[PDB]
Structures are given as C-alpha cells and as structure tokens.
Amino acid sequence: SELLATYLLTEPDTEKKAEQIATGLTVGSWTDLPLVKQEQMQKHKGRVIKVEERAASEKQAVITIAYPEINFSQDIPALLTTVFGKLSLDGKIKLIDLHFSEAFKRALPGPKFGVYGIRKLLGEFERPLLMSIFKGVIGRDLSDIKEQLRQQALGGVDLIKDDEIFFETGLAPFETRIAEGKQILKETYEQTGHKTLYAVNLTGRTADLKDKARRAAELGADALLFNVFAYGLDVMQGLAEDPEIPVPIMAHPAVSGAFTSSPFYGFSHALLLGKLNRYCGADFSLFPSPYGSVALPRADALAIHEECVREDAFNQTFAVPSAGIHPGMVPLLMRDFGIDHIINAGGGVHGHPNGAQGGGRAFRAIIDAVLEAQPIDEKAEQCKDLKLALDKWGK
Amino acid sequence: SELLATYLLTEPGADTEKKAEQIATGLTVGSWTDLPLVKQEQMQKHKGRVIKVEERSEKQAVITIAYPEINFSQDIPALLTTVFGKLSLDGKIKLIDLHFSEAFKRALPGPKFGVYGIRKLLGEFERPLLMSIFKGVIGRDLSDIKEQLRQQALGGVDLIKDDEIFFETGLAPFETRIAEGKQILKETYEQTGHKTLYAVNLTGRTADLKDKARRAAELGADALLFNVFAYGLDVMQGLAEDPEIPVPIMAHPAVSGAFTSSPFYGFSHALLLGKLNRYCGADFSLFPSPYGSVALPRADALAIHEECVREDAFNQTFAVPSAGIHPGMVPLLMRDFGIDHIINAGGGVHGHPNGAQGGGRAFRAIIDAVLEAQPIDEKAEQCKDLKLALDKWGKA
C-alpha cells in the first residue's frame, strides 16, 4: 500500500528537491546509511512519481511522491506529520492533494449521512438546499435567538446553523438551544409543511466533545456545527466514527484560512476543506463562494465541490458555498455546483426589508426560477421578496 | 477582563481605523441598530474595542483589538475562533500576537516542568543543552536504538528524541522503547556522571493520547515528543493539565509551517511556536534555527525564544533551534539564544567522523569554548573531535 502526496513548490533543480523529499522525508539522508540498513530500509523508501512544472509569474512545479504506508500508522495526525510535518517549514511548499490506498480508506469513516442522508432526512432530492444563519448571537437573550430561528425557518431555509462563535456563556446553553430549536422547528413545520434542520455549535474542551455530542444526539439535535481546524481532523473523525452520535457534522472553515489562503504555503482548499473534511466525517463543508464579500477563486471552489461529490469509498459530502451570498448569485452558484450543494445565505437574510422570511423566500424563489428555466425578471414580478433582494444586492 | 489580539493587515483599505472598527464590532456584537438603545446598553460590554492602529512593498497596518472574555469560553478553540476564525479567510490578515488576561492565564496550565524543571532533571544549569536524534530508525529494532542512545549519551548529549515520524512498530513498540531506553541511559549515567533524557514520540488517535501518556509516565518516560499541530493546542493542553502525566512535553513544529511561513497570512512564529505552545503546556518548543538549510528568519527565531522565556504566570519553555545545525554554528547560536535554549544537533553528530560520540563531543567542546571565552582554534587543538567537525562543515 502507498499514499501519494502532491505538492506545489513555488520557486527553488526541482527534481533534486523531489528526490530529497522522497528519500530524506521518508528515510532521511540515504547515501549515509550502512549497506545493511540501506538494504532493509528500502521498503520504507519513498519515490518520486512525477515532476511537472506549472501559470503565474513565479516558477512553480507540481510534484507527486509515493510514501510506503508501512511508514506511518493509519490516522491523519501520523499522515500529515509524515508527508507535511518538517516539510511544511521548508520554503515555499504547499500540500495540494493526497490519494489514499484502499487500506487507509478502510480506516477512515467518511460522513455518517452525506448528501444522500441529509436529503433523505429532508425529503428533498430535486433541488440544491438553502441554509441560513443567525444575524448575530453575542449579547443576545434566548428570546432574541428564538425569534431569529423562527423567522429563518418560516423563510423556507432547509438549514439554520448557529454562529460559530456561539459558546457556552450562559445566555442560551447548548442543550437548551437544541430543545427550544427543535420545538420551534416543529411549530414552523406545522405552519408551513416545510422541514428545517438546526445545526448546533459543538464547543468546549476537546475531551468533553464526545459526551456533549452524544448528549446532543439523545436530545435529538439535527446537526452538529464543528470547527475542525480549531480541534483537528482526527477529533472530528472520532466523532464521525461514534455510533452513539447518529447526528450529521457540519464542518466550518473557521481558522482554516490560516493555512490555505497563501498561494505558496499550507494546503490547497480542495484537500483541506474538500477531501480531508469528507474522509474525516464532515457531512457538510462550508467554504467561501467565488462571489461573496470574502471569496475563493472559482477554480478552488469547484475543486472543493468535486472532492465532496466524487464517487469514492465514502458517502458524498454536501459542499456549502458561503460568505455574503445574495440571491442574484444563485444562478452562478447553481451553474458551477449543480444541484448537489447548499446555498448558505448566511446572516444576510435578516437584512432583507421583509426580514429573514423575505430573505429566505427571495433565495427559494430564484433557485426555483433557475430550476424551472423561468426568466428571473418574471419570477421577480411574482415574488416581491425576490425583487426587493435583487434591487438591493443587484444582478 | 478582555484579551488583546494584534493583527498585521496587508492592504486593509484606505481607512484602517474604519477597518479596525468593522473587525472589532463585526467579530463581537455586530449591528445592534435594531434593539435599540435600551439593550444596546447591556451589550456595550460585549463590544470589541479597537486599542491601536498603526499604518505603514504594499500598504500594511498593525491593529490591536480588545475582546470581552464573556463572549467566549475559556479555551483555545473558542479563543482562536473568536479572534481569527472567519477573519483568517478575509484577505491578508495575520494574527501576530495575543495578550491574555490574568483570569485566562489562571485557566491555562503552562509548562509542568519548563526550563527549570528539565534543567533540574539533568542537574545542568550553566550551559545550554545538547539534543540529538536517531540516524536510521523508523524501521529499526530495539538494539539499534539502545546502541544509538549509548553512543549519543556517552558523547555528552543531554537528550535524545525519536523522529516525529516514528510511529507504532512491531520491532520497537512505544512502551518497550521507553523501558529499554531508560535502562541504557541509567547505565551511561553510572559510568559518566552525565545524565541524559529520552524523548519518545507520543502518537495515535487523539482519544487514545491520555491513557497512552499516563502509561508513559508510569514507565518512567523522560519526555513525550508531541506533534501538537497535528492534533491541536487544546489536546496538548489537556495532556499538560493532567497530573497523572507528570512528564515534560516536547512540542515539534510539524505541520506548523502551513500556518506561519506566509508573511501575509496565518499566525506569527512567535505566537504559535512561542506563546501558545508555552501557554498550553509545552516544556520544549522546537523550530528551525536561523542558520540551517531549513531556516527561519533570525527575527522570528529570536521572538520565539523571547516568548518562551519571558517572565509570565507560567514556567519557561525550553526553546529548541534545530534544522541542520553543526558545531561551527554554536557561537552564533549562543549569541542569539544565550544559555537557556537547547541545541538540536540533529544528525550533525551522527555524520561526524568519529560517530555520534565524536559529534556530541564536538558540540560539548565548542559550547564550552564559548562559555569560557576560549578561542575555537585553541579548544579545537585540544579536542580532536571539534577539529574534525569544523574541518568538515566549516569553521566557527
């Protein structure tokens, strides 16, 4: 078995580097090894698979190296430490992709529910989903939070997620949100016939996650919002592998920008937010859409989606483009991602003239228009909420 | 109480103060222009406050913001998500420093042993320490380990560490290594009066770390090499807080380059490898020296040491410069890091003409020459091992 690692080296004889990383980063200086040690450490020796040279102003090269799987235990910490530990500090080198062996994949859980599971839960298979976020949580009482939830639900969103900074501060406890949120969503459902899921933020010390997530499960929580890059992919994996946590996991990119934003260092967005999040149990994976306030280059956005949906020995992950999306962007979002993605309208929904209800309906209306091939102008005339949103945000 | 976060903004816009204010309110209370001014009062205490704004290739600004601690729980995951969660994705913003309240510090463990503790453990207080690593293991047996420990120990090495890439192997299992390495080191001590510690790699699933580390403690492990950035600062913190793991933790910087190498994104080296490691329990903190193949800007290397050593509510972390170091670099190293740091001679001792013992000897000889103001040319002539290392990698 072998694990392939692809890297982008931005400047620094790249073939030389490729070899050194293949041997030095798997066996170290090999020409100094005693023949005997050299003749048994051969099975641990990595090998250069390819060295291509990539469209910018700097001279960049793409390198793929095979690492004998016997070189590290079957877990993400061991893997990253082996293929991108010491190496991550070696000049301009970025880990772009990883191709796992069937055996390693056997040690990874993948999402418990994935696209199929979430859609099954919502009874919606013919349309990309709509997600909404609380306008704000900090310093707001339970009463405030509750109404925001109602308004988002009545708006028609399929999912409502907590703000990633919603911690256990005593204003609206974790277990209480799950309880009240569940009730409110049953009430909105009774009123509209539309099902909504509430993704509750899972926070606190790493050692307490397990019991908190199980508690969420027995309380009937719909989904668990988890900031992986604040706890580690392995911790998320532990959650996804727990049968006592039969709840979907929504991976938020909080902090991930720290090691993906750079075009020369860290990780590619597709690998981190796409492949690894998926393999480690993310049922949802949020990322900046290519068109919002904060954005990702289309290429990167598309790649994350492809990683989330590609056929693999894991359930597919729901890609969720986010950050400042507005209704006029849905046609774009739907052109790129197809129907298997979730449009995260974020908290902007509350800024709609008609409230969160209007923001949600503005979004639901245009995604329908796109699916029905109905001229948006025409839809805008039948749904004032959509027209208002388009006049305010444009296009 | 609140905590101060300092960011380095690159191309933050025309009005940096406005930008600073958008970040301050945006990452805290947001727009409450809809409550209105009856609750706005009760929320003023949740409002982020801009403390300072300094402006300066492209336009850059350094901004410090104060976040009320009531906005988040007393843990690192919550803290980093609050100050650098979504912001880390918003263009070129880098978190270069964090100033915790005494209330938060009370909630952190800091190093269990620290400089004092490990030095007390070795009985060495007037000399920077020497560290080395195995040559060709990670597929090696216990005998090669017991022999490499013996050679490096006898060479005067103060501490030996596994490769951070040495995981569960049938030949040399975690517990057995600890047990065997401990015996051989007791032996070298008996015959030289020189003490030496063995840092063993602590790996596996996060959920198994605690019991595994508690097991190392019972076995007499000298220190646990931990790849913190492969698990998370919060995990190391959990280890450092556990009194049933009365064992020093050695933080390896693996994977951290992905968060710090960029000059426009991520975290600063000093904050991640320095303050955060220390605050979360790291007794040692490794990082590339400014002089080897794999280098780190002198300024950042020094900054890390500064964070590790500055008087604080916690014990001091032993700074450990490492990447490809040789004896000739010692003078520079001692000039930069003084007495309280460890020189990670990596394989700069194994690749020595007289083996790891000669290499370790070469290092001990020159750090002594520096301390006693003895010329490297004179000390060399006295120590055949030093002469050889110098004539091989370059003189002082």
Curated annotation (Swiss-Prot), chain B:
Entry cofactors: Mg(2+)
Residues annotated as binding Mg(2+): 161, 163-164
Superkingdom: Bacteria
Assigned keywords, A-Z: Amino-acid biosynthesis, Isomerase, Magnesium, Metal-binding, Methionine biosynthesis
InterPro entries the record matches: Diketo-Methiopentyl-P_enolase, RuBisCO, RuBisCO_lsu_C, RuBisCO_lsu_C_sf, RuBisCO_lsu_fd_N, RuBisCO_lsu_N_sf
Residues annotated to bind substrate: 135, 161-164, 252, 324, 346-347
One BP term from GO: L-methionine salvage from methylthioadenosine
Cofactor binding: number and manner: Binds 1 Mg(2+) ion per subunit.
EC number per UniProt: 5.3.2.5
Residues annotated as catalytic: 86
Disulfide bonds: none
Modified residues annotated as N6-carboxylysine in this record: 161
Enzyme type, top EC level: isomerase
Single Gene Ontology MF annotation: ribulose-bisphosphate carboxylase activity
Pathway assigned in UniProt: Amino-acid biosynthesis; L-methionine biosynthesis via salvage pathway; L-methionine from S-methyl-5-thio-alpha-D-ribose 1-phosphate: step 3/6
Pfam family, one: RuBisCO_large_N
HAMAP family per the UniProt record, alphabetical: Salvage_MtnW
Family from the record: Belongs to the RuBisCO large chain family. Type IV subfamily.
Functional summary from the UniProt entry: Catalyzes the enolization of 2,3-diketo-5-methylthiopentyl-1-phosphate (DK-MTP-1-P) into 2-hydroxy-3-keto-5-methylthiopentenyl-1-phosphate (HK-MTPenyl-1-P).
Note: Has no RuBP-carboxylation activity.
Name of the featured protein: 2,3-diketo-5-methylthiopentyl-1-phosphate enolase
